Amino acid sequence: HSSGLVPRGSHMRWISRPGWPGHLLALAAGALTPLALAPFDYWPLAILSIALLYLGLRGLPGKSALWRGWWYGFGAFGAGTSWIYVSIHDYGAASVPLASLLMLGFTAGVAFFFALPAWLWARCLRRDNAPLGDALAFAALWLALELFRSWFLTGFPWLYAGYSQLQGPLAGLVPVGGVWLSSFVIALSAALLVNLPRLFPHGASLLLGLVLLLGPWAAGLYLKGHAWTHSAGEPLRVVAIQGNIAQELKWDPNQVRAQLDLYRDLSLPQQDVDLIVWPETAVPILQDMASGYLGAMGQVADEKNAALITGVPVRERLADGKSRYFNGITVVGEGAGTYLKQKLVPFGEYVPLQDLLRGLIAFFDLPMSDFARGPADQPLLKAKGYQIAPYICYEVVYPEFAAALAAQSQVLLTVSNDTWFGTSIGPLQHLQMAQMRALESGRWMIRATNNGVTGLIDPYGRIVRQIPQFQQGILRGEVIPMQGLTPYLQYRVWPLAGLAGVLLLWALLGRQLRPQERRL
Numbered sequence: 001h002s003s004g005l006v007p008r009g010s011h012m013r014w015i016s017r018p019g020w021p022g023h024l025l026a027l028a029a030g031a032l033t034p035l036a037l038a039p040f041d042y043w044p045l046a047i048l049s050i051a052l053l054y055l056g057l058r059g060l061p062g063k064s065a066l067w068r069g070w071w072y073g074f075g076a077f078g079a080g081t082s083w084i085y086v087s088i089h090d091y092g093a094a095s096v097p098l099a100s101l102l103m104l105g106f107t108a109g110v111a112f113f114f115a116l117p118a119w120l121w122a123r124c125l126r127r128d129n130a131p132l133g134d135a136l137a138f139a140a141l142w143l144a145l146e147l148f149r150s151w152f153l154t155g156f157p158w159l160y161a162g163y164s165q166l167q168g169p170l171a172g173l174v175p176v177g178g179v180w181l182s183s184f185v186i187a188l189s190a191a192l193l194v195n196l197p198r199l200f201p202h203g204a205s206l207l208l209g210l211v212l213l214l215g216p217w218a219a220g221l222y223l224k225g226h227a228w229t230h231s232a233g234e235p236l237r238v239v240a241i242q243g244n245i246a247q248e249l250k251w252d253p254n255q256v257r258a259q260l261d262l263y264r265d266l267s268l269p270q271q272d273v274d275l276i277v278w279p280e281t282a283v284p285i286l287q288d289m290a291s292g293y294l295g296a297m298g299q300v301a302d303e304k305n306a307a308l309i310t311g312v313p314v315r316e317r318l319a320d321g322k323s324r325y326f327n328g329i330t331v332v333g334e335g336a337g338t339y340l341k342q343k344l345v346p347f348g349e350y351v352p353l354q355d356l357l358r359g360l361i362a363f364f365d366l367p368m369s370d371f372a373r374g375p376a377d378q379p380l381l382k383a384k385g386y387q388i389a390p391y392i393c394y395e396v397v398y399p400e401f402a403a404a405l406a407a408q409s410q411v412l413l414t415v416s417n418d419t420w421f422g423t424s425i426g427p428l429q430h431l432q433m434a435q436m437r438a439l440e441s442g443r444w445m446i447r448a449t450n451n452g453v454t455g456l457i458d459p460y461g462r463i464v465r466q467i468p469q470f471q472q473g474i475l476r477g478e479v480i481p482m483q484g485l486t487p488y489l490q491y492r493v494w495p496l497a498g499l500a501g502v503l504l505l506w507a508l509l510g511r512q513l514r515p516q517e518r519r520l
């Protein structure tokens with residue numbers, strides 16, 4: 001049998017005990033997670049962060065476990081996504097005290113994405129006396145935890161631990177089970193290293209712990225660089241245009257026309273290529289009222305035997321009066337199709353509780369928007385006879401959602417505007433998650449940005465071609481259409497999710513099961 005409590009005199013009990021020291025370690029532990037992500041990319045920190053949290057929950061009761069999970073999550077988001085403050089301050093025009101209070105509220109609320117599972121772990125799931133089962137149960141809890149984060153309210157799938165393995169040794173597992181399997185193995189390892197000393201007395205158990213600990217790592221390295229997809233056709237020559245049109249939230253007539261003339265003038269001279277791509281809302285005019293600018297741009301592409309792909313605000317006139325808006329992208333030239341954004345950022349593209357909050361937002365002079373969600377099932381964009389999966393801005397962040405469109409495609413395309421966050425680590429984290437989509441999908445991704453990290457991503461998630469951010473530039477490069485299905489795109493989460501459900505159900509039942517001192 002095993003208690004698990006560290007022997008007295010080791011200076012390690014405060015970690016797993018109720019009180020402020022254990023919470024402060026958890027706060028710092030959570031703050032490691034951005035370190036393991038881009039741009040720092042110290043991926044072993046991801047294991048340490050989770051290992052520290054797992055250890056800090058060992059003896060803990062439910063009420064203090066909940067708050068210790070809140071402190072961990074507060075450190076993760078307070079350090080990992082605090083960069084959201086830049087958009088609110090610099091482009092929302094809010095003062096620093098105001099913007100600080102908003103971000104303080106946000107990360108304190110978002111920190112409950114780690115508080116709730118911690119509380120669930122303590123009250124119902126944790127088995128301190130079974131080291132091997134506890135590690136599996138914790139890993140399977142980590143999956144549920146991130147899966148829940150993708151779904152709840154609108155979802156905030158930021159800082160998944162799995163993204164640290166994009167260029168890490170576990171990159172071989174990402175095409176197999178997605179970012180989900182990557183997070184699962186990082187948590188599983190982290191709990192095994194904690195409980196590994198407890199298996200030293202026992203040979204067979206320790207051996208089994210070592211296979212579970214290092215087996216998947218070996219499997220990830222063995223599968224690193226393996227191509228599950230095959231060439232579908234001749235390479236496409238791609239030109240992406242990055243015009244640092246200063247974001248003006250008050251959108252004014254004289255700067256609009258200079259946008260239309262900037263993107264045109266930059267496209268014409270480019271010697272013939274297969275694809276011209278423009279970033280998010282590259283043409284600022286509504287789709288219906290830009291027939292002239294759009295129509296001319298198609299013939300310019302036609303003379304260049306090319307397809308032009310650009311983001312454009314799209315309007316829908318209802319039967320009664322006023323319109324409805326969408327953040328769309330459309331294709332002209334050698335191609336067709338128009339895609340409408342489905343995932344909308346709350347408080348950026350729309351107001352989630354507009355009736356109460358509208359007046360409140362207005363008194364503090366905060367920007368508001370009224371974009372609407374795209375339909376459930378939309379066709380893919382067509383360009384030179386190929387199926388191009390479209391992603392606008394942070395739709396790339398939702399892995400299950402991305403996989404549905406990534407399948408049934410031969411190339412991946414995203415246009416996004418990272419201007420809002422400036423020189424912070426947001427755009428790099430955002431970009432990193434875009435590369436994971438290429439690695440899960442075994443497809444090339446074209447990423448054109450209004451100003452931040454435009455590039456071409458090979459099917460291994462590696463950035464083969466890119467241009468400097470924060471300056472006007474053009475990216476010339478070649479991407480290859482891809483055929484075939486990765487295992488992750490074939491089966492998605494369900495194989496791993498079912499395994500996790502079993503492990504959670506086992507732990508839940510096994511925690512309360514009589515250990516062969518049966519009453520019957």
Ligand SMILES: CCCCCCCC/C=C\CCCCCCCC(=O)OC[C@H](O)CO
Pocket residue numbers: 028029031032034035079080425
């Ligand atoms: C003591 C138990 C033994 C275990 C080993 C020691 C554990 C503590 C080690 C490091 C935590 C301190 C890290 C401080 C928090 C990370 C720094 C940070 O958050 O920087 C992110 C930055 O804000 C992005 O812009």
Ligand SMILES: CCCCCCCC/C=C\CCCCCCCC(=O)OC[C@H](O)CO
Pocket residue numbers: 040041042043044045048
């Ligand atoms: C910085 C916070 C200090 C707290 C740490 C105290 C205990 C360290 C625990 C485990 C090893 C983590 C150290 C790993 C060093 C970084 C990993 C690395 O070398 O990555 C290279 C980089 O990713 C190329 O881009």
Ligand SMILES: CCCCCCCC/C=C\CCCCCCCC(=O)OC[C@H](O)CO
Pocket residue numbers: 018063064067109112
């Ligand atoms: C979801 C968005 C958040 C909505 C609200 C979520 C729950 C808020 C509960 C209390 C708020 C004020 C907390 C006051 C501090 C509570 C301290 C406490 O309970 O400590 C117990 C101790 O840790 C055990 O030993």
Ligand SMILES: CCCCCCCC/C=C\CCCCCCCC(=O)OC[C@H](O)CO
Pocket residue numbers: 027028031074075078079082083085086099100103104105107422423424425
């Ligand atoms: C370990 C402690 C973790 C918690 C930390 C505090 C969390 C409090 C919440 C919001 C603070 C609002 C201020 C956020 C300031 C971030 C500013 C920022 O990241 O800007 C990047 C800059 O542009 C790069 O050049």
Ligand SMILES: *C(=S)NCCCCCCCCCCCCC
Pocket residue numbers: 084152153154155156345346392393394395416417
């Ligand atoms: C294009 S949309 N890129 C912008 C990325 C914005 C990141 C900000 C995310 C804020 C989401 C909060 C939702 C809260 C859910 C509970």
